[PDB]
Swiss-Prot record, chain A:
Principal EC category: hydrolase
Record function comment: Component of the 20S core proteasome complex involved in the proteolytic degradation of most intracellular proteins. This complex plays numerous essential roles within the cell by associating with different regulatory particles. Associated with two 19S regulatory particles, forms the 26S proteasome and thus participates in the ATP-dependent degradation of ubiquitinated proteins.
Binding residues annotated for bortezomib, in chain numbering: A49
Catalytic activity: Cleavage of peptide bonds with very broad specificity
Residue span relative to the full protein: 60 to 260 of 263
EC number, UniProt record: 3.4.25.1
Subcellular locations according to the entry: Cytoplasm; Nucleus
The protein, known as: Proteasome subunit beta type-5
Location of the active site: T1
Result of altering A49T: Displays resistance to the bortezomib, a proteasome inhibitor of the chymotrypsin-like activity. Displays high resistance to the bortezomib, a proteasome inhibitor of the chymotrypsin-like activity
Induction (record text): Down-regulated by IFNG/IFN-gamma (at protein level). Induced in breast cancer tissue. Up-regulated by sulforaphane in breast cancer cells.
Swiss-Prot record, chain F:
Self-association and partners: The 26S proteasome consists of a 20S proteasome core and two 19S regulatory subunits. The 20S proteasome core is a barrel-shaped complex made of 28 subunits that are arranged in four stacked rings. The two outer rings are each formed by seven alpha subunits, and the two inner rings are formed by seven beta subunits. The proteolytic activity is exerted by three beta-subunits PSMB5, PSMB6 and PSMB7. Forms a ternary complex with SMAD1 and OAZ1 before PSMB4 is incorporated into the 20S proteasome. Interacts with PRPF19.
GO molecular function: lipopolysaccharide binding
Keywords: Acetylation, Cytoplasm, Disease variant, Host-virus interaction, Nucleus, Phosphoprotein, Proteasome
Localization of this protein: Cytoplasm; Nucleus
Record's note on what induces expression: Up-regulated in fibrolamellar carcinomas.
Function: Non-catalytic component of the 20S core proteasome complex involved in the proteolytic degradation of most intracellular proteins. This complex plays numerous essential roles within the cell by associating with different regulatory particles. Associated with two 19S regulatory particles, forms the 26S proteasome and thus participates in the ATP-dependent degradation of ubiquitinated proteins.
Species of provenance: Homo sapiens (Human)
Name used for this protein in its record: Proteasome subunit beta type-4
Superkingdom of origin organism: Eukaryota
GO CC, any one term: proteasome core complex, beta-subunit complex
Similarity remark: Belongs to the peptidase T1B family.
UniProtKB/Swiss-Prot annotation, chain G:
Stated name of the protein: Proteasome subunit alpha type-4
Lineage start: Eukaryota, Metazoa, Chordata, Craniata, Vertebrata
Function of the molecule: Component of the 20S core proteasome complex involved in the proteolytic degradation of most intracellular proteins. This complex plays numerous essential roles within the cell by associating with different regulatory particles. Associated with two 19S regulatory particles, forms the 26S proteasome and thus participates in the ATP-dependent degradation of ubiquitinated proteins.
BP-aspect Gene Ontology terms: proteasome-mediated ubiquitin-dependent protein catabolic process
Gene behind the chain: PSMA4
Modified residues (N6-acetyllysine): K123, K172
Quaternary structure, from the entry: The 26S proteasome consists of a 20S proteasome core and two 19S regulatory subunits. The 20S proteasome core is a barrel-shaped complex made of 28 subunits that are arranged in four stacked rings. The two outer rings are each formed by seven alpha subunits, and the two inner rings are formed by seven beta subunits. The proteolytic activity is exerted by three beta-subunits PSMB5, PSMB6 and PSMB7. (Microbial infection) Interaction with HTLV-1 TAX protein favors NFKB1 activation.
Induction: Down-regulated by antioxidants BO-653 and probucol.
Organism: Homo sapiens
From Swiss-Prot, chain I:
Chief place of localization: cytoplasm
Record-given protein name: Proteasome subunit alpha type-5
GO biological process terms, semicolon-separated: proteasome-mediated ubiquitin-dependent protein catabolic process
Residue numbers carrying Phosphoserine: S8, S48, S55
Organism: Homo sapiens (Human)
Amino acid sequence: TTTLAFKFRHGVIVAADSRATAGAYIASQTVKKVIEINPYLLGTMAGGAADCSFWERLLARQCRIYELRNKERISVAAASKLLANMVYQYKGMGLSMGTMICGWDKRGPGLYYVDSEGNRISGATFSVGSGSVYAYGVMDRGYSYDLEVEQAYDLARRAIYQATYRDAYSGGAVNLYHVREDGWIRVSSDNVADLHEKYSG
Amino acid sequence: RFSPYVFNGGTILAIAGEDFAIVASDTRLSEGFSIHTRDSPKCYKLTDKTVIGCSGFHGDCLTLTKIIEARLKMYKHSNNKAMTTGAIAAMLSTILYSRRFFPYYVYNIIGGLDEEGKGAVYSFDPVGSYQRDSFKAGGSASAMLQPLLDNQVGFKNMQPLSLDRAMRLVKDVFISAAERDVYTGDALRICIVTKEGIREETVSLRKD
Amino acid sequence: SYDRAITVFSPDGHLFQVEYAQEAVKKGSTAVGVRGRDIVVLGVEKKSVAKLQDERTVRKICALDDNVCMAFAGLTADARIVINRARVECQSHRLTVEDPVTVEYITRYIASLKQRYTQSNGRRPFGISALIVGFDFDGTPRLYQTDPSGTYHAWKANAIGRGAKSVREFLEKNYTDEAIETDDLTIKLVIKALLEVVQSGGKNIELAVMRRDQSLKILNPEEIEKYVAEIEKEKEE
Amino acid sequence: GYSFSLTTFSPSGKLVQIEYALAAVAGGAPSVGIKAANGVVLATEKKQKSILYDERSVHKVEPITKHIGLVYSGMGPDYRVLVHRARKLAQQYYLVYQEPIPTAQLVQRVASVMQEYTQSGGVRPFGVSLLICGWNEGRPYLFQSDPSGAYFAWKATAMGKNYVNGKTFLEKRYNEDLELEDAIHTAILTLKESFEGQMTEDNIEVGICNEAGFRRLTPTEVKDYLAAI
Amino acid sequence: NQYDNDVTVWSPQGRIHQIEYAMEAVKQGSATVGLKSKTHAVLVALKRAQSELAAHQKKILHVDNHIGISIAGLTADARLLCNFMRQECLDSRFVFDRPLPVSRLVSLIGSKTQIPTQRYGRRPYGVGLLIAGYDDMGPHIFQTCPSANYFDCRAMSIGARSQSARTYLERHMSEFMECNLNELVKHGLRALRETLPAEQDLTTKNVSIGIVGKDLEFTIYDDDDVSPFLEGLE
Amino acid sequence: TQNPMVTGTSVLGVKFEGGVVIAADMLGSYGSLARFRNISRIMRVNNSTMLGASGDYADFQYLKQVLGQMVIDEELLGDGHSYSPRAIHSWLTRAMYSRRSKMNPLWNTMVIGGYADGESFLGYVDMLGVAYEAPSLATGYGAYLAQPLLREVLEKQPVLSQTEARDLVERCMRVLYYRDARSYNRFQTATVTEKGVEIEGPLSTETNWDIAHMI
Amino acid sequence: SRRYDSRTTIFSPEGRLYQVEYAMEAIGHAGTCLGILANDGVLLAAERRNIHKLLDFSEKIYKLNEDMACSVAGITSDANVLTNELRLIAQRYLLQYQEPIPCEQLVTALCDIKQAYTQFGGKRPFGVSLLYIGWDKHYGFQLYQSDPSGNYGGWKATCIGNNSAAAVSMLKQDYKEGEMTLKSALALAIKVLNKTMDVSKLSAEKVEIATLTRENGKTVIRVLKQKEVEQLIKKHEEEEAKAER
Amino acid sequence: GYDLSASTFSPDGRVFQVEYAMKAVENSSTAIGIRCKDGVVFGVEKLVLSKLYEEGSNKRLFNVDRHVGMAVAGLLADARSLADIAREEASNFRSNFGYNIPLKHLADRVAMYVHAYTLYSAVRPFGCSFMLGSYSVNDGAQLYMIDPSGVSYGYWGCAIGKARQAAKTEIEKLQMKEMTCRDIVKEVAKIIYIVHDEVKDKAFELELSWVGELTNGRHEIVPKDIREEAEKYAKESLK
Amino acid sequence: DRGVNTFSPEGRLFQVEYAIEAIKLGSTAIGIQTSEGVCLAVEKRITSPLMEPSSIEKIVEIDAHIGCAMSGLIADAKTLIDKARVETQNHWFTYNETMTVESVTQAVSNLALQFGEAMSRPFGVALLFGGVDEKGPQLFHMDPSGTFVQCDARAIGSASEGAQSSLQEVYHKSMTLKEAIKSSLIILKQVMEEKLNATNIELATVQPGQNFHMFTKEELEEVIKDI
């Protein structure tokens, strides 16, 4: 598993792979690891798939109830705080999950990282999963806050491809998402076996 | 000490077509190095267009299949409709996660027809996570059956499915897997779900 | 535990305990609230003033938070409980959401709490009514009013307590666009509205003022006397 | 059980069930308590309805600890409950502090128990009034407790039937320099006033408290004292 | 005067008035008829509407594949009892994996309903029920009262102005055991029609039918689907 | 029940043309001691059901008590309904599984036989809640020694008669006596048929020790 | 049983709560209690209703803390319960914060308990009214008063109990704000009590006086001896005899 | 108003709610029970209020336990509650002490349960009376009667209902201590037929049962043919 | 004095009758159902010009496809609305699909008679549910007694009698949504005491293919221009 997310002038960009394994056996290569919480929030999965899916569904229903009651949409900080408080009460039992939460609100773009141990940190560049250490290198060498849209797309695709090249539990296809002011859109889903000829030549 | 689990073997398979679905399994029940029965199928009819298959620990299979039917009747009485395949999958996910800290030791596959009349296959893990696929194999010989399906259905590494072709493919893959897997194969049960309802078939395998 | 049903329906569909709570509220000291352009003003008339009493201990304008405050009319002991519930709710909200509350949010919480006491076993209704003023994060002033039955409304100007009808009649006429263009005019309007009921002039008036980014400020008697003298000088016309 | 209070305020501010409980108490048998320089004496009348009754089957004067004693006026069945609770409270205090409970602390705890029954759901107040005697720090004590829960410290007191005349007798006769024997003589004389019939050692009960502890006089000693008087 | 406000007070004549008032609540509901033959059981219900712009209230409910009920009285109590019955049937099928017999369900209903009529500050269920079922011993028609008493019937009518239907059934009992399904349905329709005012007639809008049988699960017919049964009547 | 203590060995069962037959021995072993030698491990539930259980004996007695009271209570009503073998099989499976999940199992393996409505029933329930049905059954070491012999016969001739099933039962008991360390030479048989349930015992087997002379 | 329920905690058609007025009517019969605030201390003066000759710290003044004291009027059996609760509240605050409790927090914490009884539960309220005196680092010498309904307020001179209105009028006439000392406050208390009691002349046995003062960085709560009250009474008598001339 | 709760004594020492409950039993149809040399026989007249009810509806003879039989009168719901209570008591005894409960013990336990309802204002007394009959090889035949007050007694022949006194007058003439169950089965049907009043209670049905050594200690309903024989004998005697 | 759960001599609970009496003091709400959608219109009682009309909300959003209009004691409807919202979200969480209008109505109506001596008295609020589901536009009515029905055109409140009388002649099965809006506004104008002026009324519609929608001012004057 490797998922990354970075924040720049025109919003947030999220990228993920698609392989899921059970031991040394590859169960599937069509997993959708960017969880679509709302038309205005995005979340990722890393660690346990069941835990991420269940607790982010609970978060989605709480967000909808809040919006119904208060006639206003929830913010990214509040959503991350809710998710952090729902998993601290099962501390030590054995949950395993680490998620970025991405959105846009009154204070601009937002990108938070929450994991089951208890951390909740805001940032401008995150990567989680087994192959994250391979994506930090490329992303750090290429990242700047004044990137254009196409340049940011290219950076995310290249970072994920380089992560899957050297990691054994990472692979499949690269799924890309862009969070803007008026909601998110789905950019592309590119197969690694074609990025190989695109990049090498 | 006391161990609450045993492994009873079993293989389940599902293929989704253009306007049909197929769920197949074997009928051997084992434990350790012994054979309990040769006439124990693993497919259960949920609705006139939905079938479920379970494998793993047998007691959990029995109790889970009773719980699912009770919940379906509850839903039909409260909502005045028959439950849909997507709704069945979404409810089974929650049921499975309810036992997160003492899990069911079951592998589940759901096959049927969706609301536009096309085949649907959903696969689960013992904890609840599910996914919609096009074909899926689970149980003892999943690792042997999956590459064949990837090669023949998905056309991997090569330079529509009819019903008859799918039937032949299912029979062939179980005939091949009976050769090498210890836990698999006394008879083969096939359930075909289509517009007219659910049809059943049986085939004979090796006995040793 | 005690599980008697205290409040129940009567023929013609009335709830008598809630009506008697209304009657209890209609005997308190008058409280007037006005919503200006950049200022919100609250005023209370002191029912009894004695020279042997400390004023700091009998104030009827409290601060629920750094941006929300309220005045009440009715039974004092009930208000002392409702206020301390609202404070805890404000702190819990700021902890969980990382954002100061909205005036509507806190008035909704108070209204729900007050309504839940007219449908429970072994309880009697709260005998208080409330005016809640504040400023939202976007800078919009807010005035709300809450009823012992559990209903709340937004107002431009309002009065509760005894003699509230006369003050409402005065405000229906004297509340205009030109009368709230500056803070002095708004304060004078509040004082004049209170003067329709209070006796002995400004010696029996407590006045509080809030602005967009400042905390609640209690006006000293000298400022009240200055304003009253100016209002009396305006009678010479 | 009923969860509402059966004792409530009257439009003039009176608690009426308490007045009725004291009305019950004022119809009980007389009791006298006298505090002297060496100890305390408690006396009570023990007339019984017939000769078939066993005179020694039940007692009115009872010990709470080695140094505390009780008498009562009112209803016997309530007196028994109060005695049981007082004994349990004294034992709890001893278990905690490894020291005998002082008289004032016991009277406070018993008065608290008696007050709990005035502001509780579905119960009626006790219909008994108590006299407590004890010895602590080298000096004696004498306390009275009422059905409402209020306690007082006395020097000489009378209670029950015709207690006003008993109080007048004690006022005109009590002196602070009496020894214990003069106190016993005065107590028996006070019981003699307004007595019905001829009194013997079988129809009165006496108990004393001094340095050695609390003890209840045997009928032989009561006979000696009656002969002396 | 003072013996009629509580359910735990005996009248000097040995009666409980709150139970009688709960009985009076049932008599104000619309009529319902139930009858059986050697092979089938049938419930016929007459529905009511508040106005021409409102749909007619439901009166036949599904309890289990072999059990159905019909209602007269308070609706919410009927819903509560129906949910209790459904839960009991589900529990029986879970534990023993066979259909619950009808008489053993009626015993449970009576046992549940008797408890409120004995304790302080509680009220009887003000609903009457007709229960149609089929099991290994054949068709069954049961009738339930608010006083926790139940009866086993050959045919029975409950609701307002239901004496006329009872008289018709008493006259025509003899033919029921030999009638087939269609004639049994027509007999029930005639008995139900005996309760209508002379200016009002049966229509597909206000008639509901529920049938259970040997090789037939409990089915409900409403609206146009009751047209074949009305055809040929009279 | 974390430890078994006094235990039973094995139960055998086979179905024939018009009923079922079950067999079990009469020994309760405490470890390796062979302590109680005349105990009965076969039960008659009602006029068409019989039960035989192996494993801990205290748990078997407890289930006897519970099942007997349940049958008596359901018979008191007099409504014309009675439990079938399948209802008992399902109830036993539910009870065993419900007790497994509390981590406090009942250490038993049970064989239910019955004959109702012209159809015969032979079912198997396990300690963990594994339950199934088969034409022949054997628990414990009988699963290894006796099951091959029963299945060899049942494959060639699917439908037996009463005498053939009886004789097959004694042959299996003799083999078990030869090759099992916790066995005994006195056993007991129960047969359920259209007439009802009939228990016969104690019986015995004739052995052969000729090979002792070729050593 | 609805038949025997007395419905304590309900409103009246005029919006009143009859049990509370009945409790307040009960309080108006107890002994007079008076509190005066000065520049260097504060004092409580109470009337002794126990005057039987055979009767054997103080009768109606209790110590709650190192810095506070209180006196009650009404029904003593409930005053004991309230005092025992006040002590526990103060100890809990000290345990939590390792500092002494301020006066107003203690008064508020008790008045909450008093109001809870009047709003729900089915039981009757407490028929007692209290006067509190103490010292606090935030505000200094203070004086508070409570009611059965849960209402409190600070004062500079107050009186509760029998003949409260006459005492309040006399205090309004004679109290000089900002110019009082303990020596003058004691004389004012003696004068008001003498003008309130139903006796021809005051006596030292019928009154108890407690003074709270702050010396050497520590609070001192002192109950005056009889031979000091006798001298105070003699001084008042001489001043009154020479007052008119 | 001394008659509104079960926890109030009248100024003369009576609890009126229990008497008002007894008046409910006094308006029911009669049931009798006769104890003989080797068994007990119960007989009830069951009134039919319509021709639509099936035969065998609203049965008033219950099987509490294998060796115990019960016959009720009064409100039928209260009787059906007490039958379940008695069934639970017998089941608990068998599962705790290992053998069948003696009848004198079950009667005492049910009587204490019934009496527990006549002390509080939060519940009301039962409006039912009933008879318990049993036969044991060790204890002989036994017959007990229980009361809404909670009083339990043993009898040789008893009757409960509206026609109690006439039925007792007829039973006193039997001399039942020397004859078997077969004669008693005819005599109970005869007594039931003569105590019935057909001009006010128009129609009725006869229900009979026994427990004895002829059943080997089991409580059973009388076989049909014996029932018609007894009915014919009673009718020809009545003629 | 009597309990909360006593029957009347003619078999009715007193408290339910009193609550139904209390219903008839609220403002008039009118709902109309057509094959093109459902419309809800409600009256506002502005008691003073110093009040803000926008603070009075009597038409709420249960869900994106279900809306509710209420009358009676307004403060009591908050609990029912909260329960309805929670049940719809629970249904979506478990089954991943939208609840129907009838199921929401049953879930809300199961709370009606759950009171005793927890709630101590009935609710005394009447509700109209308007929604769009697999069967099309649907309008449901629910009252304090716990009974709910399906309607074609309903009027609740103080002037329900005359409004229903007018709806009887006005309504027909072929109405267009625009005609339904016009007719509802005409009836509301007839039954009100004040003058309809696009400020003291509230109007909402639910149509297939789009969510629950609340009319703003400009549409209100545009529609009222014809009246």
